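Limitations
The structure tokens in this dataset are predictions for the assembled complex, not deposited experimental models. Users should treat interface geometry with appropriate caution, especially where small molecules or nucleic acid strands are included. An illustrative entry is reproduced here so readers can see what is and is not provided.
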Amino acid sequence: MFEIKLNDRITEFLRKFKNSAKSNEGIDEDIDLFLKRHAIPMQSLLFYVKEYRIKELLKPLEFEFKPKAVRGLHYSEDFKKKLEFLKYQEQELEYQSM
Amino acid sequence: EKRTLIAVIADEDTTTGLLLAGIGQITPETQEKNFFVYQEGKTTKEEITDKFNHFTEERDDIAILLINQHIAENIRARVDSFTNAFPAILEIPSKDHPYDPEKDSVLKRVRKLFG
Amino acid sequence: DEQYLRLIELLSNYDSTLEQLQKGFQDGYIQLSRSNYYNKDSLRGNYGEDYWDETYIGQLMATVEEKNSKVVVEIVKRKKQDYDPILMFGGVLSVPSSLRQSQTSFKGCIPLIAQLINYKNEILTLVETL
Amino acid sequence: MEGVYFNIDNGFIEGVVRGYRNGLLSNNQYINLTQCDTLEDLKLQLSSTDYGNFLSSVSSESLTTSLIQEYASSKLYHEFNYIRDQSSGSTRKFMDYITYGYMIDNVALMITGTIHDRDKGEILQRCHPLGWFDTLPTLSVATDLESLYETVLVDTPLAPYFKELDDMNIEIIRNKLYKAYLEDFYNFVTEEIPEPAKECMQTLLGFEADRRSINIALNSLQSSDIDPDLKSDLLPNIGKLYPLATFHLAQAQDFEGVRAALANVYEYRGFLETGNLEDHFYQLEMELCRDAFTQQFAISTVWAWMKSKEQEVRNITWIAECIAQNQRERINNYISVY
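Predicted assembly:
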């Protein structure tokens, strides 16, 4: 549903894990992707904490929520123009037909 | 504890889904309508707050109050004012508005901890 | 404090549940919608209002334990009105095969609803504790 | 010949209904709707078709898939009622019969609401406009057999079809009513409808009765209390399955037996083998209606139009659902032959 922002504590702990028990190929690749993604799944964070147990837990929490879908992203420009024309006609209808 | 019934304020389709799940339209005894069918664009904050108060203050047997999350977002202030333990409120996803963690009280409350 | 790590784990169990709650409803709705489609066998069309029965006593009953500072809630069969709710929509001959899938998804949501309530309460207790 | 005498009474009606047929969304228009990504965008796009401003009374925010379905269906019913108004004689009987199915649906809905503890006052808001009749609210006196034919239904045109009151009993009454009604309407078509429309409506009613027979046969397996005698009483005598395959379906008490019975009929074998059955039934219905529109001087064009426009209302609704729910990966699951 949401990941954890890559704050200073997150970055430092990921760097430590990269050369720690979490240095496995899959775990290291996931940590690198999170650094690229600016956030890590918090279940993976708990797994890395277990591997280390190290760094403290307190940090400036910031939850990266799953981005909301952008409505109309797949619209073609011709479709956008068609919708705009239809919207103009609908707006006109409110008083042209009055 | 005498709380043994479930209350819902929801959309018609979410209410239909909950009915299909097994929730009933009225309590097993002294049955009363426990479903409020919110309609988009046809219900003001006053009605939603009134029914929320109806289910949270009265109807002492209501253990769980299931609310479609858009309804809660409409009346977020009232829900934030609400504070109790016998009745438990739970926002559930709607047909057109899926569950949005950015409008969940738990996320903000945990973020306030900074740990 | 090391207990914070457990909090994260707790949150994980919350997060997954939300997704398992994001589905079930998400599926339960679309199949429900697909049941409005296939409306030829339905009484009126869209499954919703005009199909419900106020006389339907809930097949599901929720019990509050209150056995600790963390409130714990469970959902079980309610203790005739206590009939299978799909029959409410004409469940013997007229419901589409997709309404049954919708019912399955919505039932599968309920244990996740109870779990989500429990985890929300535990997270709030831990927030008040820290 | 059909056109020699058809246009004396049904010329204007058939022309108008053929115009409505020309108003059915083509696959291109369905694709354009599919490209829409919000309900308000779908409303704008749908305003460019013959649906026009049917949703002008609905603001962009108040718009919901139930409103879209309700308004499209209201447009369809207003068009059908207009065509019925222009109808007289045998055509008027044909349209009255078309409304008889929705009258049966309304009877079943009212009695289901009655056993469900909903007052008739609110249920009448859900009754289809086509199925309205004077004694509709009076029929549901109580949850007992004294209702309907015993007190009020005798005044309705459904009275001849009636020759306890639990949900299962409600559905048995509804299925018996469809069985009798479909038999009576097949008989009326055979005895009173000119030859091209006669054969077209016979084929369409055969398909409708077969759709029912198959659905009842399949669904009664799910731990239903309907004995094979009752099932035989529920299957219409007019379908393409009658009498061999109908008997096989009635006696069959397992899925494999039902599939064997369907395998006996060429027109339907393959429907139960794969894919969702209702999709196959809808595709066959649409193909039959599209064929029915090739015949010019036929009143079947009315039925073929109704069941076509009704299908359209489903499609426009299903898209409206997938757009509303962001289930675009299945937005194309509609049936469109035009």
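Some entries come with short summary sentences. For this one: DSSP finds four helices and three strands in chain A.
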